[PDB]
Amino acid sequence: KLHKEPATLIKAIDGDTVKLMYKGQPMTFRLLLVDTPETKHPKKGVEKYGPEASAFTKKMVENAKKIEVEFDKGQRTDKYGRGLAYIYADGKMVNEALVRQGLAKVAYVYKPNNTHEQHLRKSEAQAKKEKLNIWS
């Protein structure tokens, strides 16, 4: 079934992308099922809440004493070679934490990499209802 594996932070990149050492390899990982507002990509600009989603992820992974990587059941890497996973910082899923704060939307739902979809949809509806950030 799904299993959590250890990883080590090298550097946070932005809201949904973090570089980690995973089984001795530096790899960058893209957070499954979420999309945060983009900081720097000229083809969208800096969207509202981009600095804030990036600050949230940075803080959460840099202060964690234990980072874990949990891959889903389909593809492990996307077309850019990034690892696709659920990242947990001290047992808390970062992908859910950003959606619960209204700093990410549930996006890019590619079957069968969707085991936590319902869990994430539940947090997003609670953040919309609370008119948090992206929803305010």
Ligand SMILES: Cc1cn([C@H]2C[C@H](OP(=O)(O)O)[C@@H](COP(=O)(O)O)O2)c(=O)[nH]c1=O
């Ligand atoms: C989250 C995710 C993104 N991607 C791809 C879709 C997008 O491709 P394109 O670049 O063609 O738009 C891109 C979005 O990533 P970012 O949101 O980091 O830009 O990464 C996947 O292929 N699978 C995934 O599960």
Ligand SMILES: [Co+2]
């Ligand atoms: Co994006």
